[PDB]
Amino acid sequence: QEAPEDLLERLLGEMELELIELRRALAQTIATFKSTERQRDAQQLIAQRWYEKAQAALDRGNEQLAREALGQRQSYQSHTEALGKSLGEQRALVEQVRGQLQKLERKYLELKSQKNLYLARLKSAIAAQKIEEIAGNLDNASASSLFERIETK
């Protein structure tokens, strides 16, 4: 098995690639969200153009023409309402997903901060033991062969 210390660096790298993936994914959501907004605006303008035409029809007592004009607007009005409700619904979604990400990035750097601190301790501990065992070679109990053996010689 590989050393888990190496995995610590590689594992974070994998998570970094995905964060940008979510990053690009979110933009795709926002881009569509804006586009749906424009389509609603354009259609109501057509309805407004039909209403402003209706702002010309029944004047001078030509009510009949106004009736058909508003009827035409109603078809656009129905499509307008559906988009409006659809537009309203999506807003809570994008706010939620961004809030997820914003909380999310903080969790990353916090983990990265602790990464080196524990690596330092491991280097300390390994740098700690490998000497005292050599100091242990000069043990006072005669288990040593470098120091007491030469004296007895």
């Binding site: 990053r23 690009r24 979110l26 933009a27 795709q28 926002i30 881009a31 804006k34 586009s35 961004r98």
Partner: protein, 43 residues
């Protein structure tokens, strides 16, 4: 274009409507407070 425009909006989040209100609020105070001395200095 909207795709790219939104991409930045993620990377550089817009200032909140809050600080917009306060900066506008505080800024009006500096101009009035700063102008207060002049309108009294050379009334």
């Amino acid at each position: 274009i909207l795709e790219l425009e939104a991409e930045r909006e993620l990377l550089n989040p817009p200032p909140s409507p809050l600080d917009k209100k306060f900066e506008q609020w505080e800024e009006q105070q500096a101009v009035e407070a700063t102008l207060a001395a002049m309108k009294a200095r050379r009334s």
